[PDB]
Amino acid sequence: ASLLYLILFLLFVCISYYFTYYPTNKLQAAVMETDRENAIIRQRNDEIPTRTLDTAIFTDASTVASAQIHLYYNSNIGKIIMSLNGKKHTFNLYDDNDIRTLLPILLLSK
């Protein structure tokens, strides 16, 4: 049929265009995939700033103090490192204890 012939010719054009102007090996195709994936990774990751952010901090069960912290989020292990007074503490976004420790210090940023 005419429609089938047109579809076959379009498939021809698409396959030839891909094989000529696009990579045909695992390495370069994987590099392109990694480029797109890392772009998405960083678009999500840049939402967490490393600037000096003021927040209320709970050193004990009945104490509070206002101080500046730094935040660095990584997706290889999916954790947030919080920097306070020159000391860095890593909190996982998958562990319940780390989540319970890190959520108040983020939600109470003055």
Added chain:
Amino acid sequence: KTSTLIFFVIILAISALLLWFQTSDNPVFNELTRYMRIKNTVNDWKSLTDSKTKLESDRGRLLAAGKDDIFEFKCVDFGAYFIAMRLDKKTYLPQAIRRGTGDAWMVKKAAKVDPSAQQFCQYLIKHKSNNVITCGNEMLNELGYSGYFMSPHWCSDFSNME
């Protein structure tokens, strides 16, 4: 009808000749395909540089944690020469003391332990530190290479060591 079949056979023969030249070790086809391949590779250099620089930026961000001494100039010894380097506060990429309009300053060593090289690297740290060069995109736009994909080089060796 007859002309269509004749042209069908002729085009099949042309395709068979093209395949014969493609598969065989013909110098002419080799020259043409090498021309095309070199041009395509030099075109792809820019994308490769961007990807490697970005990945190195991520690994520099990951590496520079809990270490404030890596952010300051240090006389890193490369077995044969000293380089006064650090990590940039913005791009988190290796940044060293630049020699004029060239690459990083390489204080040549005359021995395994060369005190004079270390003294001169310290002198550069204390006096000539306003001129710096950073691996990545500034390196590409200044000297033409990214610092990576080059071995041996201070960017690649510093990334491998740290």
Added chain:
Amino acid sequence: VYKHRLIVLFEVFVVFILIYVFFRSELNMFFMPKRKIPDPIDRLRRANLACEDDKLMIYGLPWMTTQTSALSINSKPIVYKDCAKLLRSINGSQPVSLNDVLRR
């Protein structure tokens, strides 16, 4: 003539076989978009702070729906009566979700 259509179908079939045998992974990456890795902080965006009696409380937790008390630096329960005022002076009377905190 059906023979010509059979020949062109054999052509497209052998093209598909050649693609599947050798260029399977490349075409799978290029044409099929793979799922993205889930973002745990995207899940945590729905969390917000309030007061469970005299203690800190985190509502909107899909990780643990049950009631959990927020942990301080030394991983101990937080018990302040004035924590509501601190929340009002930072986020407001309404419990501000972590999504708005990230948007800040």
Added chain:
Amino acid sequence: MLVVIMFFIAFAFCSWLSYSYLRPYISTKELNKSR
């Protein structure tokens, strides 16, 4: 019919050339057998 046998001859010859060209790679046993 004549076009069919033309296609058969052309495809057979071109497949022979392609197979002879790709024998070192599609048959890894050949390359690893001779070091």
Added chain:
Amino acid sequence: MITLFLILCYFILIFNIIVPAISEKMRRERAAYVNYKRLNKNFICVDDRLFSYNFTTSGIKAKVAVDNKNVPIPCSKINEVNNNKDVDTLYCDKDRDDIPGFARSCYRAYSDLFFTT
């Protein structure tokens, strides 16, 4: 006679694009494997998993290191991983769904192989 035109198109496509593309892909992947095995050997560390690249009939393939209970081996003990050559390897061709982001790690392994070679 559009059908004969399509037949000629696909014949030219296969025997003047795809076959040279197969040869070019094999040549590039074999070169990468050669530049990888000339210094590196056994497993290398990518995204906290361990990957090795071997050349087969249909190109290069990356196999990931796993223990007895199909769990990827953490990178920290690659030393002993190089000592034991009988460690379990899982191919990247099969999309095995138990490991979170297995294809992600495989793609990053191929990208790292390209960058190193």
Added chain:
Amino acid sequence: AETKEFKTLYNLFIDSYLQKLAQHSIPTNVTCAIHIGEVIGQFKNCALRITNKCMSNSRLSFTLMVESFIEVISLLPEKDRRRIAEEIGIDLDDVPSAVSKLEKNCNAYAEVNNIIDIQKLDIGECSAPPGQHMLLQIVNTGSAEANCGLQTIVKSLNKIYVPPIIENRLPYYDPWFLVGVAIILVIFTVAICS
């Protein structure tokens, strides 16, 4: 054709040793020479590099050689690096600034002068990835015992297995048979249609 050098373990070792010799270079009054009667090269991408260093201090020569060898095998697997180490006669646990078994074996060339005399040399097949060449070196040094160590280490590194680049391109001969058959069969189909 300006092609890159295909880096290989023995090539890295030789280049590191040469760089260490250059950076500890000291003037000397001894004459060091290379004399090759014939050099024959008939294979493409078979680069030949005749570097003529010579350091009179052979003790430092073995020190630098062992240091370079240790830095080279710092990337090999542990079992392979160690077994190659006993094959050569160098022990990692020993400091490079120490006399090893290899040096003791090669001291038998102390009396002879630091000249490299080759009656005839031919470069064999050099299979390299496209865009690169297989480079072979003929390095002289200030003592024939340092030379002994050099060639024995080079042979030991050559003993390893590196996968070769296989050439899949068919040999090319002028294909008039194909066009002849095409013309004959065009005549055949013309007759068939007529």
